Amino acid sequence: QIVLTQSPALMSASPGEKVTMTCSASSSVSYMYWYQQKPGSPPKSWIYLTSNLASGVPARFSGSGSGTSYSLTISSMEAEDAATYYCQQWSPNPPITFGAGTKLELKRTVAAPSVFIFPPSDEQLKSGTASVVCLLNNFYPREAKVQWKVDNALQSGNSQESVTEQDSKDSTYSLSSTLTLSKADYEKHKVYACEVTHQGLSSPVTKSFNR
Amino acid sequence: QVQLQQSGAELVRPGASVKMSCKASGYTFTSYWITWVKQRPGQGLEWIGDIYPGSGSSNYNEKFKSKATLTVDTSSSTAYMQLSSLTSEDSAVYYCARLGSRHYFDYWGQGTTLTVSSASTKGPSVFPLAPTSGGTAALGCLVKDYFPEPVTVSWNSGALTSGVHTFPAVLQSSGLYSLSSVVTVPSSTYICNVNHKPSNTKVDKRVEP
Numbered sequence: 455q456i457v458l459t460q461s462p463a464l465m466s467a468s469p470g471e472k473v474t475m476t477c478s479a480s481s482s483v484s485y486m487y488w489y490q491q492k493p494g495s496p497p498k499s500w501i502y503l504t505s506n507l508a509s510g511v512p513a514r515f516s517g518s519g520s521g522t523s524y525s526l527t528i529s530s531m532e533a534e535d536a537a538t539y540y541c542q543q544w545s546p547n548p549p550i551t552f553g554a555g556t557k558l559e560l561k562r563t564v565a566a567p568s569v570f571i572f573p574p575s576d577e578q579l580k581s582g583t584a585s586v587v588c589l590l591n592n593f594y595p596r597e598a599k600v601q602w603k604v605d606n607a608l609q610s611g612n613s614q615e616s617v618t619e620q621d622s623k624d625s626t627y628s629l630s631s632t633l634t635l636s637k638a639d640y641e642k643h644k645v646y647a648c649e650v651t652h653q654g655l656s657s658p659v660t661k662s663f664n665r
Numbered sequence: 666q667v668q669l670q671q672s673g674a675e676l677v678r679p680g681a682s683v684k685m686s687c688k689a690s691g692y693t694f695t696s697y698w699i700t701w702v703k704q705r706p707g708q709g710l711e712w713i714g715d716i717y718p719g720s721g722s723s724n725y726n727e728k729f730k731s732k733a734t735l736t737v738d739t740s741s742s743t744a745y746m747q748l749s750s751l752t753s754e755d756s757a758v759y760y761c762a763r764l765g766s767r768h769y770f771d772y773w774g775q776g777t778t779l780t781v782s783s784a785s786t787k788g789p790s791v792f793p794l795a796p797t798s799g800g801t802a803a804l805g806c807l808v809k810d811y812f813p814e815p816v817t818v819s820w821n822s823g824a825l826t827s828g829v830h831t832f833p834a835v836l837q838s839s840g841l842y843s844l845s846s847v848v849t850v851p852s853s854t855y856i857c858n859v860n861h862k863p864s865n866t867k868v869d870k871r872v873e874p
């Protein structure tokens with residue numbers, strides 16, 4: 455039951471930079487393993503027996519450490535090295551344990567989002583339910599704030615957010631916020647605004663429409 | 666080549682059992698240990714246990730000692746794991762790996778997604794998204810209120826691929842999922858093809874302003 459704490463939780467790196475993620479153990483361990491996982495696919499053995507590279511693992515990767523602190527180092531970041539890296543311990547004791555993983559993202563310039571609002575579809579209005587969607591397209595960094603406002607009044611609890619994985623081409627993320635209220639409450643109001651706050655925006659952007 | 670094919674996704678009610686398969690090929694099955702790994706979104710990876718197919722001998726993580734049960738059928742070269750009396754905490758992706766000669770898992774299986782629910786399947790309701798910030802304009806599809814995961818969204822039966830973002834599914838207060846798929850196109854026809862396999866809901870839709 456050795457607890458492996460991995461840090462940082464997530465980090466960014468521009469190709470060419472030296473990346474180093476740490477795996478600190480709650481007690482001393484005999485060996486340290488590392489796995490590379492990208493979305494949609496099963497993990498891949500990356501480092502075995504504290505310092506050896508698995509089949510396919512390129513030379514830029516290397517792992518070391520002892521006692522309570524082992525590390526995975528990439529001499530010079532590549533674009534394909536954007537993945538989650540999990541560490542895993544072995545010792546004579548039986549529970550081989552894993553780390554929560556360090557997600558390695560790609561660094562890039564700040565980019566303001568493109569905001570678009572979507573009024574409920576006529577088909578869905580017949581169904582007695584109304585969904586206003588707000589799209590935040592191609593932006594960096596991931597942290598973007600979305601405040602729904604109905605007739606200037608801040609809405610809460612009836613919105614759901616979703617963020618895409620970092621783009622393969624431009625390394626930006628997209629976000630969508632979905633405000634879903636009953637047809638009854640939708641007709642009780644006129645102005646539907648979507649307020650976006652970001653690092654790339656000098657002041658918040660508000661895309662809106664009247665019912 | 667050395668392949669490990671896992672069984673399809675399961676939707677099982679809580680309290681019941683589940684049995685998944687990992688069909689091994691391209692190697693002498695009875696010569697290398699097979700391990701099972703649990704993966705819950707966010708709480709990393711978890712070692713369940715291993716089994717040596719040539720002996721039936723098995724090691725279990727004391728956490729899962731009574732939850733999982735590992736078996737092997739050397740004739741068909743398949744390894745099995747049964748998860749007894751399922752709970753919401755058992756909903757995870759179950760990976761199956763072969764422990765290699767060099768002390769590391771050299772081959773893995775695509776994984777089996779276990780969804781632990783008594784709720785019956787629900788087909789989504791597809792809705793269009795009304796077709797200019799940043800010189801571009803967007804349109805899309807709202808795949809709303811479905812269960813379990815996943816849905817497969819394509820555009821123009823696969824013809825349109827650029828500028829398309831199929832958002833990750835979101836859990837709604839209603840317990841059902843809902844994803845959006847938007848396609849961004851600037852100043853210079855559009856059909857979305859949604860597919861939910863669990864309830865055979867293949868629905869096409871044309872998005873028009």
Ligand SMILES: C=CC[N+]1([C@H]2C[C@H]3[C@@H]4CC[C@H]5C[C@H](O)[C@@H](N6CCOCC6)C[C@]5(C)[C@H]4CC[C@]3(C)[C@H]2OC(C)=O)CCCC1
Binds near residue numbers: 698769
């Ligand atoms: C899938 C089953 C494998 N399990 C453990 C089993 C672990 C081994 C147990 C015996 C060890 C003897 C020795 O001290 C070391 N030397 C041997 C000669 O060469 C130089 C190094 C390492 C050693 C082989 C361990 C390495 C990691 C081994 C494969 C672990 O595998 C992983 C992936 O962590 C995981 C769950 C329990 C069993």
